[PDB]
Structure formats: C-alpha cells, structure tokens
Design a protein around this ligand. Structure first.
Ligand SMILES: CC(=O)N[C@H]1[C@@H](OP(=O)(O)OP(=O)(O)OC[C@H]2O[C@@H](n3ccc(=O)[nH]c3=O)[C@H](O)[C@@H]2O)O[C@H](CO)[C@@H](O)[C@@H]1O[C@@](C)(OP(=O)(O)O)C(=O)O
Ligand SMILES: CC(=O)N[C@H]1[C@@H](OP(=O)(O)OP(=O)(O)OC[C@H]2O[C@@H](n3ccc(=O)[nH]c3=O)[C@H](O)[C@@H]2O)O[C@H](CO)[C@@H](O)[C@@H]1O[C@@](C)(OP(=O)(O)O)C(=O)O
Ligand SMILES: CC(=O)N[C@H]1[C@@H](OP(=O)(O)OP(=O)(O)OC[C@H]2O[C@@H](n3ccc(=O)[nH]c3=O)[C@H](O)[C@@H]2O)O[C@H](CO)[C@@H](O)[C@@H]1O[C@@](C)(OP(=O)(O)O)C(=O)O
Ligand SMILES: CC(=O)N[C@H]1[C@@H](OP(=O)(O)OP(=O)(O)OC[C@H]2O[C@@H](n3ccc(=O)[nH]c3=O)[C@H](O)[C@@H]2O)O[C@H](CO)[C@@H](O)[C@@H]1O[C@@](C)(OP(=O)(O)O)C(=O)O
Lengths: 419, 419, 419, 419
C-alpha cells in the first residue's frame, strides 16, 4: 500500500505545466466508441482511470494504443458488455452504455454501487436513454439497454444538473434519428470539449456550454484528431498549493476562462493573480491566506472538485471560513484527517465551519478520495514536521506525476512502500 | 379581511388569457429609473405590487400612470429614498438601489426584513454594487449606497444564482464606465426580458439567458416602448388547474419555451399537452393525475414559484409524489392547510412526501403566501363541499383578477368582504 | 397594532420575580377537564393564552375564574368541541381532545393548521389516543374522537419525542381501564408538573421526568390545589437580558434544576452564575459575552424556546457562534430582523452562523413569534438609539408584564399604538 | 478478500441464541483497566473488535486471555499509549484514554480519523475529561491527557447525547475525588451494563439508564465477575431476518425490554411477536411485510444500528416506507448496493424513500460497514438467485458465527476464500 512521506514546511513556488483534463479525456474516450474511422486524442493525461478505460475499450474489441496521445480504432467492435469487476474500479465506465446502444443497438454495463463521496445514482443517464427510445432492464446487477434500429431524437428536460448524464445523452443523440434537445444541460467545460470532439467526428451539435444543447443525429461518425483541454482542477490544485504556502507560481498550458470562480475566490483570500492566453500566475507575497466563504454548485460556479483543497486553505487561513458543499452528500472526509494535523473545524450538515490556524503539525493521515488525497499531500507540504499520507493510490487516479511536479516546486516528498 | 368562498367539486375547463409577467414588469419598472426620456411599458398586469412600485417611483419624483400599459417619466427624479413603511410591504423595492446609485450616484433603501417563505437576504445585491464601485453602509435600517462619479465595470462572479441580484447588477452596469461581466448569472426569462428592455433604452447587453452576461456601460439611457412577456407562473397555475380537475384548457398569450420543465412534468402526470406559437393546451381527458417527483432549481429547471401548485397536484394524484424545494427554506406552508382538507403528506427537511387521495374535503384554510393562496383556491375548486380561503389578499399580489378567470373556467367562487 | 418603543443602550440589572410557567399552566388547565371536583391552580401567569384557554373551557360548560390562581369547576360539561375560530388563535387547544374523550367518551377539536415556526403536525397525539382505544376521524377540519366506554391502557412507544403528545396521552390514560406505559416520553419539567397535578387529583402516575411513564387508570379524578412551577424560559430570557447588557441580575421564585443546559451555556459565554434553593444570579461584570455553540434538543438539553434569545447573545458576542435548531423547521425568523439592526449572520439549513458585533443600531423590526419578539425587545434595550418592535402582541402570549419587569431593570421602554 | 456466496430465496426460520452485546463488552473491557484485581467478563462474543481490544490491553501491560469469558488482570499496567496502527482499525480504543488518566494520571490515544458512516468526532470525550480536571494536548496525531493526582468530580452537562462520551466520563469519574454528575447522559442499555460492571468492581454509581448519572469517586476498584447482557442489535437483526422471509423465529438468551422500539416497528410491519423472560418469538405467517416509517434517535427510540436492516425490510415490503437517520451523517451506503439487487429507493438528505418490491435479484454487492454487510447478507437469503457479498470481513466485527446461525435457520450460505 503505497504512501507519501512529506516533510514540511516548504514554500511551494515555481512553475508547473498543466496536463490534459481527466474529466474531458474520459468522456471523449468513451465517445470514441461512436467513431467508425481512426481517432487520435491528444494531450491525454497518464492516469489510472485512463488505463482502466483503455482496458475496457480493448475488451469491447477496440484497438487502443497510447504514449502523449491515445490512438483509438473502434471499427471492428464485437462485444458490448462492461464487466462488474471492471466498473467497480471506475464507475465512469457507465459512459459506455450510451455509445454502445446508439451505434450497435445494444449494450450492458454493471450498475455501479455506491462511491465514497456519495451514492451517485445514475438514474438520469437511464432516463435519458429511455427518452431516446432505448429499453432498459436491470438484471444480475447489469443495466441492459437495447433499441430496434436507431434511437429517436427527443426533447429531454433534465430535472437535476448532471455532467455525466448530459454526456451520455448528448453522445447517444449524435447517431439518433432526428433532433434531440437537452434542457437544463450541464455547462461544464468538459461538456463543451466532449461536444466539440463529437462535432469533429462529424456530429452536429450546438448550444454546448449553455443549458440547452441541440443535437441533430447523423448516420455515422468518422474519425479525426482532437486535443483535450487543460485540466482546470489540476490547475486550481497547484494555485492553491502556492496560496497556502505563501509562494508564487505560474501554471503553463492553462485555460483561465474555466476558472473564474476559483480565481475570484483566491483573490478574496488575498492572492495576486494575473492571467494570459494560456497561463495563470499567483503570488501570495509571503502572506498567509484570508478565510473565504464557498458554496459549490454546477459550473460556472465554484466546482466541488476544488472544495477539499479550499477546505485546507481555510483551515490554515486568517479567520473563520465557511464551506458549503451542494453536489455530493459525503465530501468532507478530509476534514477529520486534517484535524489530526491540528486543524479546527466543525461539520454541520453539508457545510464546514473552519477556524484557521497558524501552522499544521505533521501526522499520519489517510487519503479517502481523489481530491482529498491531494489536499492531504499539500497539507503535509506546509505542516510542521513529517506527514505520512496513506493510500495515495487515490491521487494516481487524477493527477499525472504530482510527486515530480510538487518536488519541482520545492516540496520534500517521497513515495514509500506500504505496510 | 377579504376571503374566497369556493364550492366544489367543479371541473375547470375552457380558455384563459395570460397577463404580463409580474416578475418581469417589476424589475423593468425599477429599471425605468435609468431612463431620461419617457417610457411606456405594455402588457403590465394589474397587481398590488405594481401599485406599490408606482407609489414608490412617484415618491422618488417620477411621473407615473397606467391603464394596459404603465407610462413612466423619470426625467426629473429628485428624491433617492425608499422608506421603511413602503419596502416592508414589498421587498422587491430593493431593486431601486441599483438604478438610483448608477444614475444619481446615491440611493438608500430600507433593508428588507424576513419574508414568509425565507429570510431572503440581499447580500449578493450589495456585493455586486460594491464590486461596481459603490460604497454601502447600513444605518438605521437603511442600506445607503453612494459613488463619486459613475460606477466602474467589473468582472463579478456570483457565488449563488440569484434572479434579484443579477437584475440589480445588470441594471446598474448599463450606466457604468467600462465593461461588466456577470459570471453564474441567473438565466430566468424575466432576466432576458429586463435585459432587452434596457437594450431598448440604449443599453449594450449580451449573454442574457446564459450564465455569463456582458454589459458595456453608456453615458445615458433614453426612452421607448416595451411589451412585458407572458407570466409563465400564471400559465403554469392554470395548466395545473385543469390537470387536477380532469379538465381541458387553452392558455392564450402564452410563451411555451419558458415552461419546458413544467410541461414535461405535467405530461409525466398524464396530461395531453399541445403548444403553438403563443398558446398552450392541456387536456386531462377526465383522468386523475399520476404522482410525480419534482426538484425546484434555477431556470430552466422546475421553478419554485410552481412548487405549491404541484404539491396540490400530487396530493390528489395517484401514487406517492415527492417534491424537493431547493430555493426557499420555508415554502411548505400550504401543506398543513391542505392536510386540513384531507390531504396526506409528511415534511422531511426540504422535501414533502405526498400520498395522493381521491378527493379533498372543503374546509377553512389560510393563505400564507402568493403561490400558496392560489394553490388553496384551486384546492377549493376540486374539493368536495365549501372551502373558505382566508387572507386571499396574498393572491392579489401576483394574479390579475384570478376570480374572474377561474369563474370563466367553471369555478364556483365568490369574494367575501370583512372577514 | 401595539408596538414597543425602546431607547438604548441601557444596562439591564437588578431583580425580577419569575411568574408561573406558561407551558405548565396550559397543559394543567386542560387536564382540569378531568376533575369532577373544584380545582385551584396557583401561580398561573396572566397571559393571552391563559385567557383563550379559560374562554375555551368556559365554552365547554366549565366554571372558570381567576385573579394569582385560576379556579376551575369542571363538574359539568355541556359541550365537547373546540371551534376553529378559537383553536386558530391557540393550537394548544388540541390538549382538550384527550381529557374530553377520556372522561366523556367523545370530543372534537379543530385540526390546527400551520404555525409560524413550523408545520407542527399533531399526528402523535392522535396516534396515542387511538392506541388507547379512541376512534378518530377528520371531518370538515375537525378531529373527532370517540370511544364506547372507557379507554384501555396500552403500551405506547412514541417514535419521536413530543411534549404535547406525551401530555395528551398521559392525561387521557388517567381515566383509562388498565395500565398505560409511554415509551420515549418527553422528560420536560412541565410534563413532571402536569403529572404531579394529575396525581393530586387522584391519578396514579410514575416515571414522569424519565423516558418511560406508567399510568394506572382510575374511575374518576377529584379536585384540589396545585401550584404551577416557575417558568424556566422567562428565567432564561432575563438571565440573557443581563448577559448581553453587561449587567447583573437575580431571578426570584426560580427553579435552578430546570436550567442546567442554559446556565452551562451562559457560563461558557462568560457569565458568573450562582444559584440558591429558589433563585439564580448572573453577573457579567460589565463584560461583553463570548460566542457559544448551541444545539437545541429535548430536555434536559438546550431548549428551543431559548434559541432566539441565544441567537441575540451570539450576535453581540465576541467571536463566531453557531446555533443549530433541531426541534422546529423555521425558527430563525428573528435573524433577518436583527440583521436590520446591524447584526451579521448567515443561515445554512437548520443552523445560523453568527458573527458577533460590538453594537447594534436601533431600527424598526417586526416580531414574528413569541420568543423572537422578546429577543427583539432585548435587542432594542442594548442597541444604539431607538428601536421599534412592531406586533409585540406576540410577547403578550407568554410574558407576564415584561414591560414592567424590564423597566424595573433599567430599560427605557414604552408601548405605543398605531400600526 | 473473503466473501459470502448466498443462494436464495430461502425462508429463514427456527431458533438462534443471542451472543453477548458487542457494544457492552467493548466498553466494559476498557473499563477493566480500572480494576486492580483480576476480572472475569462472561458471555463475551468472539468478534474481531474483541481481539483488537485484547491486543491493545495486552500492549498496555495487561494479562488477557479468553475462551466464553475474557479474563483480565490489569494489575500491572506499565504502558499508557494506544498506537495509530491500532486505533486506525478500531476507534473504540478511544475508551482507553479515560481509565488510563483516571487511574495512572496519564494516557495518550491516537486521534481517530473519519469513519465510513460519519466523521464521528470525539470532542465530548475530551470535553468531559477536561471538566474532570485532565489537561488534554493534541500532538503528532495523539490526544495526550494528564492530571496531577486524581481527577475531581464535576457537574458536566452534555450538550449532545453520546454513548461513547457518557462511557468515558462515567468510567473516569469512578476514581475521581468527589462527586460527578452527568447531565443529558446517554440512556443506552450498554451504558447501564457498563455502570453495573463498574459498581461490581466497587464503584458508586446511580442513575444509569436515565438522563442524569451520578458517580461518587472511590480510591480504587477491585475485581470480580460480570456477565455481559444480550446483544440487542444481533437480536433485532435475526428478528428482521424472519420478518422479511415470511418465516418464524425464536431468539434465546434475549432481553426484550431493550427492544421496545424495534418490536413495535416489527408489529407495524405485520409481525406476530411474543416475548418471555429471556426470549422473543416472531412469526410472519408467510406474510410479506408492510412498509413502515422509521426515525432513528438515542435509546429508547429506534436504534441507528438497526436502520440498515429496516431499510431492507422496507425495500421488500408492501408500500412506501420512509426512514430518517438522525445519528450518523453517512449511513445509507447499503442503499446503492441493494438497488443493484433490484430495490427501488431515493435518498433525500438524511432520509430514504423506499418503494418495496415483490422480490430481489441476486447480484454482486459490496459490504461497506458492519450493519450494512449483515443487511446485504440477509438480502441474499431472500433474493432470487445467487448473491455475492464482497468484503464480509465487516460482518466479523460485530456478529459471532453469523454464517452458522443463518445456516441453522435454512440459509444457503458459504464463505469462499479470498477472491
Ligand atoms: C469522471 C468525471 O467526469 N467526474 C466528474 C463529474 O462526475 P459526475 O458525472 O458523476 O457528476 P454528476 O454531475 O453527474 O453528478 C452531480 C450530482 O447529480 C447526482 N446525479 C448524477 C447522475 C444521475 O443520473 N443522477 C443523479 O442524481 C449525483 O449523484 C450528484 O449528487 O462531475 C462532477 C461534478 O462537476 C465532478 O466532481 C467529478 O469528478 C471527480 C470526483 O471525479 P470522479 O468521478 O472521478 O471521482 C473529481 O475528479 O473531482
Ligand atoms: C419579485 C420577483 O421577481 N420574484 C421572484 C424572484 O425572486 P428573488 O429575486 O428573490 O430570487 P433570488 O433568485 O434572488 O433568490 C434565490 C435564492 O438566493 C438567495 N439569495 C438571494 C439574493 C442574495 O443577495 N442572497 C441570497 O442568498 C435567496 O434568499 C434564495 O435562497 O425569483 C425567484 C426564483 O425564480 C421567484 O421564486 C420569485 O417569485 C416569487 C416568490 O415572488 P415574490 O418575491 O414576489 O414573493 C413568486 O411569485 O413565486
Ligand atoms: C404549549 C407548550 O407547552 N409549548 C411548548 C411545547 O410545544 P409542543 O408540544 O408542540 O412540542 P412538541 O414536542 O410536540 O414538538 C417537537 C417536534 O415534534 C413534532 N411533532 C409534535 C407532535 C406530533 O404529534 N407530531 C410531531 O411530528 C413537532 O412539529 C416538532 O418538529 O414544547 C416545545 C419544545 O420544548 C416548546 O418549544 C413549546 O413552546 C413554545 C414555542 O410555545 P408555543 O407552543 O406556545 O408556541 C415557547 O413558549 O417557546
Ligand atoms: C462501539 C460502540 O459502542 N458503538 C456504538 C456507539 O457508538 P458511539 O459511541 O460513537 O455513539 P455516539 O453516541 O457517541 O455518537 C452519536 C452522535 O454523536 C456524535 N458525537 C459523538 C461523540 C463526541 O464526542 N461528539 C459527537 O459529536 C456522533 O459523531 C454522532 O453524530 O453508539 C452508537 C449509537 O447508539 C451505535 O450506533 C454504535 O454502533 C455501531 C455503528 O458500532 P461501531 O462504533 O462499532 O461502528 C453498530 O451499529 O455496531
């Protein structure tokens, strides 16, 4: 069981180059199941989830190869089932159902169980496919979908904003007969990126980025080359790294317009931020951050994927900061761990009352999820002494070589064998 | 204390002509404070709040008068205060602060206290004006704002979706120096309508209806003629009137695209719905409605202003319906009253578990707010016997002659004076 | 519409004599319906609710007259109904159902609608009576109960702690055939007081004050004399009065053991508290209070009836105080009003985040409920300037001559007419 | 990674003998640290947590051994620290802090991190010890407590009901100087059992089982023999096993008075229940259960440790059942798993809306916690087909030979080796 041994305090500063967005690469890779011709997806980060996705695609009869890019050849797809033992390691595989049924008239994915940060039901995904004409049946833990011929475009109103469901529906609609309209669609940058990828394959889509997406089905999708956009969460994570350590940092290969909420909040915390066409710089000028108030919500509001990181910022900030999480029912698992490091906070329903302290104390903590693990690692960087973050495998799911990037910023970190 | 005596059951059917939107007319009337030339706002409903708004405007030195239209002449505004005894009757008067400060460099509105359905703080309004350069201070219960010279355009990220705050900021920005960008802006139809009104006066706005509104300030705004859009909540209310009484109805002067969520939910309840360019028809074919699940959220999702009405629908529907309110913390006040009429339901935090029953029994109930009062009146229409809805004054705030429109649909309703 | 005009700031200090408990007198007065012989209830406060109760009792055919005591002669009862017009002004009228059905085999009370602080359903009351053998129906807004012969003792497990329901069931069981056991009964001091009153009339009860109350029915109850215990909420209100004004006070005719939670919290806020057999003294030594964290819950925990008052204390305390209300869904109505006076707070679900300030500014505020009104009046006493609390009629419901008592403590207060 | 392979459907019926209470054995075992003479604790279940507790005790310099009983000789404790690697596997080890500091004037336990069902802070434990005079510092992830001489008795008001904190304080107080009074103490049967155990060692305690526990310290505690009471949760689990499979069962070595709430709810579901001095029988008469409504709360109300099991009951019951969890913020982890087996439900905040179905379908599910694992195993027993419950190690933490006991009731179950 790998772990990270971090020695602090160390001011994090310097430069870092942002990798491709994990949450854009994943939906785009599954969307590739729709491509009949050759496809090359560029700037794909090297993450555990990308490996799992490739393993799943390959089992479906896809030809997959990667490096900076991931080359996909769907053409000859002969299997249409996502095994239980595979989706249990990555629920994002639910995104295979849509393309499979839309292109091959059938598909079955193991119904994902609960996740650490929430139950994360997938009802809207199913509701959407059903509205497009698919017939779904649940048996042996497998959501089995089928349709006689092509799906039919439909006017679908989402009764809850879902990034995942928007992707599933939008993807399946590209090969549908007629026009589909998604009301109250998710506006996340990844949705826009997935949309443009589909359009590159020949799909006809408009409205991506707004709460109404219109898709006009076509007979088939070809192939092509598409470069994934920068990972805004990785970017926000490193900007926070500097903000909490009094450092200064410049993120290269960034996309500023995808972080208005985060940048605004960082400025409220006292950061000196400047942006360029493809870079963001943050300088704390050696100052301790000012406590801020946050409320997660669908894009363009403050993203829930940044909440754990900002919880940390508040826990070492000047004043009382309050964070309210409205997307996932169980995303405060990092709090009890940071408290072990000396933080002071109380959880009341879905909001954490933070009472910032001068300095944290190194201690043995346990990563519970992707963003929490990154938060605990950053905590170790600025804490006084040695911190051991157990279960860092979580971090390998969404951060490409974070160990190296952090070290290059002045961190004293070492990955060490488990047990 | 006026009351409504309703005798049922009576199947509501026929036609109704929708009046101008209450929530478009209000923000537009206050926006008129920016106009230097004469203004004519058409299709303005005759509601108690419109009277109060006119009173307030006149009290600021505006020349106001009305019929179907409301004619405004704010060329010589010579007062900049919205008195307590006035805003205590209509919290929407907070919308005067923005235009006053943007055009005259000053303004003071009584800080509104709590409302029945929620505390409804106005912090985002103030936060927005402050970001535009205004200096605000609260003294003696009055929110006093000032700015030397014009306001300056700014990039403002709304850490909460607010219809009111979006209106305040967007309105004040039209006369600001530079460009303003509102991130995570409210996308309600009224916002779009208010934006187009401002544009008609000469303002430069784009993005209305999306989560990013861009305003480029100008030196001054002129005058003109603008027709308010159809009231989608009145429309939804009457469509529900038919859906719960097994009737059929056609709403004239309607705007279908503003009700996707509502129409989708009505179909789920079993309604046969047809739409035209400016009309909507619903036929229940004498059927009892099927219970539905609702989750209120910012537009284009299911509107909280229709929640009470749908609570009623579920309470007389076949099955167990669940309604989750996410906009206002206390908007279930109608529930205890309907229970007096024989309804069955339990309130768990912010959601009501409904157990539909065949029929309701007439009884004495009390209106607690605008939408609840309309719900109780509809309940009386389909309940068995005589229902008395006390304090219907609430209904006069947002429904233009609902008594007449309902009667024309077959309702047995009478307005009883003094208690 | 009476109002209170308060001039501040003024230290509140001196002495006050606590009146009889409003919430002990009420259930005991209704319990008297069980008495076949004369009954004298001593130390009954002069409150609006006591008048309404006497009005209701008299209209049931009871002979009632009062001063310090309330003399009851329920030997004859010619009416077994509590009218809408009457219960709509006091939901506590529901307590008449139990005794009426237990002694006369029948009874009906108008089903109370919603209340300001919560829906306050009365299901457990009905559930309890039904378990004792009563048959209950809801027709035309009235809950009609009946039983052929006596009620039969039963083992009732309350699946929720309810003061009201415990009183209803315990009272009705005294005339039941057999033994009744109430599991998870409310342990409030008033329950104990009501129990001892019944025992004085000849009833056989044990366990009052614990979560298991055992009642052994008897054929009939006689009469007697019983003195109501001190009102712990009035006591807590005056102790808070001193704590927030840096003053000192001694409450006479108090019962310390009924306020462990409150006294503990006041000490946490920095109060110097001393207690005697029947008195409590609190001295702030001119100190500003320290913010505290509160979580309302059934007795002996912190009482929800003290919550509004402690919200005030936190709002003028040094630090960030957090209050969580778990008894009533909407009991933060005082918050928006105090904010008008300069307080700083945010409401997140069922908890208020308070940010204490040095001084409050006088302003026009509106009482929304009993405890809130008292809170707004105390606010006016310590605020800078003139405060006008509209609708103080609310305060007359549960505070006997609060004006006089506050004045005797140094308050500058006066009641004025004119809505 | 051990798993359970279950073949269904199978009616569970017959008899089972209840083991000693896990949650009474644990606090009593730690309480033994106070004993200067050898102690024999009888009827101790063979659970993983008992092993861990013995490991910890031994590691403190205690002589421990077991079979049906666990023999303890803590006469020579020479070590006072609970290590991270140990408490991370069982947070209940926090109960070592109290006795250690009360008897040896010092003690340090690793601050437990978050748990699956909730953050489970331990603040009240620390607050209590501090009130008794201990000085508590937090360093390196270790809560370190110390006191010069003996602790002093104090009047402690628990501003929240906590089983664990009540045990910690009550245990430490036995060796304190003076009298301690715990206000708003937990009333759980285990508290009563732990109290009587301490009294057996010579401690002076009264009030256990009520809101107020009074402890009068003594110089030292001796030794003795104490038999742990029956495990009410195990009992409830098997009663539910019968109730959901139409079977009949008799639990031997049971203690009925500890399950009033559960038995009442089972009757509401339609069970025919009879009780004896030390046994409980439940017969469903082949009847499918009726949906019920539950709201967890402190004893004697419906226990949260039975919530998962009752969620299952509702999911296969006739009707819509609603369960509201008020003790732990994340105890619905079994829901998503049961949904994989065909169950239908929605989670809204802290309550689950259940829509019972005829029969469940076997599938691969994952145990997430102790009670959830038992629920998934019972689900497998009544589901159609083969169910595989992964991670059943969870079940070994609180159920002694559940495999054997279930088999003896007609279950087709088998523990297949890792993987
Ligand atoms: C793969 C991917 O796109 N993941 C990201 C994606 O995930 P997801 O698609 O599940 O989001 P959704 O918008 O659909 O869910 C939002 C809310 O909607 C509910 N929901 C979702 C679908 C549905 O059918 N029904 C439903 O009720 C959720 O249970 C939740 O309460 O959107 C989230 C919100 O912006 C990110 O927070 C997440 O990232 C994380 C946690 O990734 P993870 O899944 O890998 O763990 C992250 O990296 O931070
Ligand atoms: C005047 C008018 O336009 N009113 C409509 C308008 O009202 P409002 O501007 O207050 O909505 P907001 O979007 O700003 O509020 C939404 C949420 O944001 C909070 N909020 C709002 C402003 C702020 O500074 N801070 C803040 O925390 C609210 O307290 C709430 O929790 O938008 C609501 C949502 O779509 C309608 O539900 C409402 O209609 C009602 C209730 O009208 P009412 O105000 O007249 O009573 C209705 O007719 O149903
Ligand atoms: C008359 C009297 O004894 N009133 C006091 C009494 O009132 P009540 O009996 O209604 O309390 P309950 O214990 O029954 O209510 C507690 C919780 O239980 C719910 N509840 C109650 C009864 C029931 O059948 N079902 C049910 O679901 C409530 O709706 C609430 O969510 O107990 C409350 C809690 O300690 C006091 O807060 C209240 O006092 C106030 C507000 O008086 P009020 O009734 O006059 O307005 C107060 O003076 O502060
Ligand atoms: C070891 C043991 O006695 N465990 C049982 C024991 O556990 P615990 O001591 O933690 O209960 P508490 O009463 O103290 O906690 C109740 C509530 O109080 C909070 N709490 C607790 C202590 C504190 O200092 N502060 C605080 O805020 C909790 O975080 C929770 O929100 O009481 C619970 C309630 O009756 C059982 O539900 C639990 O059983 C479970 C989950 O066992 P577990 O601890 O092994 O996981 C079970 O079902 O077996």
């Amino acid at each position: 069981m790998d772990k990270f041994r971090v020695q602090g305090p160390t001011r994090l500063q310097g430069e870092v180059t942002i990798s491709g967005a994990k949450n854009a690469a994943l939906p785009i890779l599954f969307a590739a199941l729709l491509a009949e011709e050759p496809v090359e997806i560029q700037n794909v980060p090297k993450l555990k989830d990308i490996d799992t996705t490739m393993k799943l695609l390959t089992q479906l009869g896809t030809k997959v190869e990667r490096x900076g890019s991931v080359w996909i050849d769907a053409s000859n797809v002969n299997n249409f089932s996502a095994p239980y033992d595979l989706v249990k390691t990555m629920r994002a595989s639910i995104w295979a159902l849509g393309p499979l049924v839309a292109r091959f008239g059938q598909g079955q994915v193991s119904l994902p169980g609960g996740c650490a940060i929430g139950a994360r039901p997938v009802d809207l995904h199913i509701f959407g496919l059903e509205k497009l004409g698919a017939e779904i049946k649940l048996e042996e833990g497998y959501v089995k979908a089928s349709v006689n011929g092509r799906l039919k475009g439909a006017h679908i109103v989402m009764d809850k904003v879902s990034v995942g469901a928007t992707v599933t529906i939008m993807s399946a609609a590209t090969l549908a007969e007629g026009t589909t309209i998604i009301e109250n669609a998710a506006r996340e940058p990844e949705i826009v990126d997935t949309a443009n990828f589909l359009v590159a394959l020949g799909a006809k889509i408009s409205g991506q980025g707004t709460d109404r997406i219109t898709i006009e089905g076509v007979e088939r999708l070809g192939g092509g080359v598409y470069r994934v956009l920068p990972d805004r969460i990785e970017t926000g994570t490193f900007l926070v790294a500097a903000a909490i350590s009094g450092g200064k940092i410049v993120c290269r290969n960034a996309q500023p317009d995808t972080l208005d909420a985060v940048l605004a909040k960082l400025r409220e915390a006292g950061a000196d931020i400047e942006t360029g066409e493809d870079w963001i710089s943050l300088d704390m000028h050696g100052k301790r951050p000012k406590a801020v108030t946050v409320r997660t919500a669908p894009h363009p509001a403050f993203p829930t994927a940044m909440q754990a990181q900002f919880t940390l910022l508040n826990l070492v900030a000047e004043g009382t900061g309050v964070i309210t999480e409205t997307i996932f029912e169980n995303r405060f698992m990092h709090v009890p761990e940071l408290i072990r490091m000396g933080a002071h906070a109380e959880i009341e329903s879905n909001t954490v009352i933070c009472h910032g302290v001068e300095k944290l104390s190194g201690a043995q903590v346990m990563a519970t999820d992707l963003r929490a693990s990154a938060s605990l690692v950053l905590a170790g960087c600025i804490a006084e002494g040695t911190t051991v973050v157990d279960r860092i495998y979580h971090i390998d799911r969404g951060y490409e070589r974070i160990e190296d990037k952090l070290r290059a910023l002045g961190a004293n970190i070492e990955r060490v064998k488990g047990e």
